[PDB]
Structure 1
Amino acid sequence: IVTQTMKGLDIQKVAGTWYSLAMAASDISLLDAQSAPLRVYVEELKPTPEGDLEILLQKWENGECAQKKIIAEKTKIPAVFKIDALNENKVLVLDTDYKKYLLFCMENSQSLACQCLVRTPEVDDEALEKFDKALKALPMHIRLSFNPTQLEEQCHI
């Protein structure tokens, strides 16, 4: 479904701290519950020297905020990774300036969730504008965004 990818991505330059400032999904149920399946809060990206992507994140699971570590394997397209898990979910990098914001989507095989990542616990109105413009014609039915207080809490409580 997603046909916005970042050209010239240098995955090594996405390394480090990020915050999930906003999230949106195709289907309400993907983000609706607190333990909704795609309601995930990015902590750190750790690219490997081979160009795969180790992802640290938190998720609400079984009534608490759980730490996850997920591996997204590279493909022939630099902006597209495949999660080493049940149905091979695709991670697409739409857009990034490495130093402030990163937009990404995840999709299966037809469900979709996208996020606006930022480097700091601040509302970045220009990153959110780029996020909303990217989503404009994706078929999203739920959107969440977080305040700075929430961005500094586990699972954005």
Structure 2
Amino acid sequence: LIVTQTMKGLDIQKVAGTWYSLAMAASDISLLDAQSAPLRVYVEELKPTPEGDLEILLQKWENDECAQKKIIAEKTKIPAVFKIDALNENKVLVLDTDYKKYLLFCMENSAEPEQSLVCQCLVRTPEVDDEALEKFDKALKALPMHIRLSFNPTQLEEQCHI
């Protein structure tokens, strides 16, 4: 119940396609700190399933290489809230999106919401969106964030943001 503003009326079909992890933030520094930190993941593809779930394709830097991971976000009552079981998290929350430009989401472990909160700013094109970053920074002030990372367009197009 830390993250309160979830997008009421999210249409999961319109978020399908390619995305880029433009910026990310977390409540615990060490979970996002290093290149191989456990919550340092880069979203590639969001693909809703026929069952109404959401498949999240992301890359993660593991053992001196960029590894491909897939994680199923299963629907719940709340349209913008999904349940998962990867990265020691169990919930995906969509804060806001306009589908065409940007999407803001957070991940949480409901058992330890203050230490597991990690949020990201996704963008449709591999460029910096000042309007997406501003909406991203505005959502973070209400959240207990202690680390913020930003990436340039060149890194958005490299494997694991180089």
TM-score bracket, normalised by the shorter chain, equals over 0.9
How far the C-alpha of 1:49 sits from its partner, in A, is 2.1
Unaligned runs of 5+ in 1: none
99-108 or 48-57, larger mean C-alpha shift: 48-57
**CA 1:111–1:87 in structure 2 vs 1: closer, same or farther (change >3 Å)?**
closer
Contact 2:76 2:83 in 1 (8 A): yes
Contact 1:73 1:84 in 2 (8 A): no
**Partner SS, residue 78 of structure 2:** coil
**CA 1:150–1:51 in structure 2 vs 1: closer, same or farther (change >3 Å)?**
same
35-44 or 47-56, larger mean C-alpha shift: 47-56
Contact 2:106 2:117 in 1 (8 A): yes
Aligned length: 157
Contact 1:12 1:51 in 2 (8 A): no
Which residue of 1 is the match for residue 120 of structure 2? 115
Percent identity, aligned pairs only, is 99
How far the C-alpha of 1:156 sits from its partner, in A, is 0.2
For residues 85 and 143 of structure 2, the distance between their equivalents in structure 1, rounded to whole angstroms, comes to 25
How far the C-alpha of 1:13 sits from its partner, in A, is 0.8
Cα deviations by residue, 1:56-86 (Å, 9 ceiling, x for unpaired): 1100112211011111111111000011448
Using the size of structure 1 for normalisation, the TM-score is 0.96
How far the C-alpha of 1:88 sits from its partner, in A, is 5.5
**Partner SS, residue 129 of structure 1:** helix
**CA 1:88–1:132 in structure 2 vs 1: closer, same or farther (change >3 Å)?**
closer
Contact 1:44 1:55 in 2 (8 A): yes
Using the size of structure 2 for normalisation, the TM-score is 0.93
Contact 2:26 2:145 in 1 (8 A): yes
Q: C-alpha root-mean-square deviation of aligned residues, in Å?
A: 1.2
Cα deviations by residue, 1:90-109 (Å, 9 ceiling, x for unpaired): 10000000010000000113
How far the C-alpha of 1:50 sits from its partner, in A, is 2.0
- Indicate yes or no: 2:80 matched with 1:75: no
